[PDB]
């Protein structure tokens, strides 16, 4: 199981058009409580959110830490029956941890330890964004700006549709 589930809820990513974004949650926000449920880990957050929805709560208070103050925001409780979520995720830096042999990324010489800065002239801060851009590639070549030991390198590669994942794949795994 991923180790963030037992870690504190420090926001690394805010999904676009998500409840989280609408009410102004930012990366760096530390979620500490929701309604009457203490949130010490990502797992607590997940469980509280599901509990509230199933008990029929529509709106509740979300308690954040931001620059050492508590912020109180009213949020719509996501509808778990529709699979709806809050729209936050922990930080995963776009750093390559693994490269599948034979893959498009392997072929163009991407190596573990590379930092992906930019996809198709669009700066990215997280692995989710890389994934998003690959999903949206339409199987057409994508350009990546990479940082390797402080040096800027340009790469261009074509995503393959992968039957296991049901979507485009370039062959990169993030560092944990």
């Amino acid at each position: 199981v991923p180790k963030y589930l037992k870690e504190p809820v420090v926001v690394g990513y805010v999904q676009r058009d998500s409840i989280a974004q609408k009410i102004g949650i930012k990366p760096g926000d530390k979620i500490i409580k929701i309604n009457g449920y203490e949130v010490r880990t990502w797992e607590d957050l997940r469980d509280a959110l599901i509990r509230l929805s199933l008990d029929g709560v529509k709106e509740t208070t979300l308690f954040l830490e931001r620059n050492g103050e508590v912020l109180h925001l009213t949020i719509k409780v996501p509808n778990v029956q529709k699979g709806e979520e809050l729209g936050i995720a922990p930080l995963v830096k776009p750093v390559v941890g693994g490269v599948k042999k034979g893959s498009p990324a392997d072929q163009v010489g991407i190596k573990p330890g590379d930092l992906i800065l930019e996809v198709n002239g669009k700066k990215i801060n997280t692995w989710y964004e890389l994934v998003e851009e690959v999903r949206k590639s339409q199987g057409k070549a994508i350009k990546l700006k990479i940082l390797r030991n402080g040096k800027m390198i340009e790469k261009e590669l074509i995503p393959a549709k992968d039957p296991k994942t049901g979507t485009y794949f370039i062959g990169l795994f993030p560092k944990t």
Partner: antibody
Amino acid sequence: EVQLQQSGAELVKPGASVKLSCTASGFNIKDTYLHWVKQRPEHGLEWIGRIDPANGNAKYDPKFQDKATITADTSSNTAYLQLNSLTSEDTAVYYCSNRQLGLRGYYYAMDYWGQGTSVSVSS
Amino acid sequence: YIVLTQSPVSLAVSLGQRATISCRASESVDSYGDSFMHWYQQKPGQPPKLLIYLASNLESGVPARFSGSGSRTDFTLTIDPVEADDAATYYCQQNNEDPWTFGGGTKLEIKR
């Protein structure tokens, strides 16, 4: 919102063929695969096959390779399942489906099913 | 092809208590540090619904009382506590290798 909408129930006679359809909303089939699953009355689930709508490449379970034919139309966002040379073992509910998954480091699941299409093979 | 043998075939669990369903694969289903094995719930007259994917990950909205564990050839779905809504047939499914296969199903009865 994502939907897979399947055509209505079919009564067909043995020996013949039928064509079932699945129409997708809220996503482009061209970016993924559509799958077909068979479920006979009182039985479990059996994977028939998938198609890549971008290149018409369809893959089957060898057992269905010749009794099922899967096609897709990207302009109308629709996948089809053709069953030929129908026997009574072909009588079942047929499901179209899509799944997409994020891996270690970025886990997510997109999983959608049509409501199923009942096919009765009878004289 | 990968045979998936699911056990038990049927069971009756009291509201509040633990359900355990196992899936055995004829060959491994791991690749690059993930197991390509998933669990579905199928209610009567409804399409399957994903619960757990890649052995251990909860689908959006699925309660934590559902968990999946295992790797390689040996996998378990745990339902603890079981609730009224869990009355259904459960299936493991693998897609590490073509063709995709389902287990035979496990029918869960709820004791009330």
